[PDB]
């Protein structure tokens, strides 16, 4: 609701960032391997952007990626709803 | 509302374009460094497109980027709503 679907997105993005490094380390070639840029990747994913910076290459890496999209795109399909209603009515009055 | 969520997107896209150049200049390698293409990048971002043209590489650059996505995707999650209702009813009558 208010700042609720917000919080779940944050749990998803941290754990997603975390699990990606665990899943991607060990596969030769992957650049999704340090906790910083792994987090930026999970934003890049939870939010449709597709910049082509980082992406997974292992199987378990893509699975962690799917978990983010669903749990993200849904959260963000609700977080921007809140922002919309909020500031639009705010500026109305 | 009418042409309101419109205007906020424009504030976001200009300032976003502006701050990106400030944040990205100084980091060796970044191509997000001139006010023109910085603006095109912020459209590319406020609107899910992910063409892979420009993207940030500094930390503060990605932060400016996140501010755009939220303030953009939300604006654009409302700007296309207006357009939809508008022209669909227009053509109905």
């Amino acid at each position, epitope marked *: 609701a208010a700042g609720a679907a917000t919080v779940l997105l944050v749990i998803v993005l941290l754990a997603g960032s975390y699990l990606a490094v665990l899943a991607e*380390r060990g596969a030769p*070639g*992957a650049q999704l391997i340090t906790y910083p840029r792994a987090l930026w990747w999970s934003v890049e994913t939870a939010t449709t952007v597709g910049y082509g910076d980082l992406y997974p290459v292992t199987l378990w890496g893509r699975l962690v990626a799917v978990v983010v999209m669903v749990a993200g795109i849904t959260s963000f399909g609700l977080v921007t709803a809140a922002l919309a209603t909020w500031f639009v009515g705010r500026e109305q009055e | 509302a009418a042409g309101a969520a419109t205007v906020l997107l424009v504030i976001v896209l200009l300032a976003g374009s502006y701050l990106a150049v400030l944040a990205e200049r100084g980091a060796p390698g970044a191509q997000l460094i001139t006010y023109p293409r910085a603006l095109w990048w912020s459209v590319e971002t406020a609107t899910t497109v992910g063409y892979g043209d420009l993207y940030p590489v500094t930390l503060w650059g990605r932060l400016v980027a996140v501010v755009v996505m939220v303030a953009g995707i939300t604006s654009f999650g409302l700007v296309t709503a207006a357009l939809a209702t508008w022209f669909v009813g227009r053509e109905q009558e």
Partner: antibody
Amino acid sequence: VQLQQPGAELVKPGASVKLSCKASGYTFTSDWIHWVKQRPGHGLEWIGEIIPSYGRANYNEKIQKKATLTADKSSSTAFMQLSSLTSEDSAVYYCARERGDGYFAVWGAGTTVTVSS
Amino acid sequence: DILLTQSPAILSVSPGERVSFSCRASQSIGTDIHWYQQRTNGSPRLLIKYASESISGIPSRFSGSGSGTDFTLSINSVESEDIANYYCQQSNRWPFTFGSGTKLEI
């Protein structure tokens, strides 16, 4: 001393050996422990990483995989098991503490392994 | 496995004078290179991290330069306490690799 590992070991050819790395200081959930090998007068040969908390280890693709990594989450000490050695396997063996951001901030003093009878 | 290539192998110089070890990667790694100093008998020791930023507790002579595939450790002046082997180690793609090494003579 941050990373702490013993002085030197002696292994008979073909035998095995374990190696320790006890780390006072912090023991983060997110820390990794790496091991690097330095044959005398040579470069730094990376062997493998291990995240002691979660428990997974990843070894070096190219080299002859003689080793296997372990940890002790309630002792803050990590181990490396080298099995069946030759004298091509005599070198210094450091451990390093990588924060998760991709560099070896803290190093051990290095253990000197000597495979001979 | 990314190939880090440190040329030259050895480096002569006279004291107090700028010196620049070069490193060159087999492909683009961005800024994810890091420099380590290792003296005789001693363990390695981080110098420059993420190719430009500095470590707290490092002589300001050491200047981190470069990006892309070209990289440069630089010492704005030299003194006798800097004689050591120098290594670079990338972190851009698994697995982390190391350079050949470069020793500094005076």
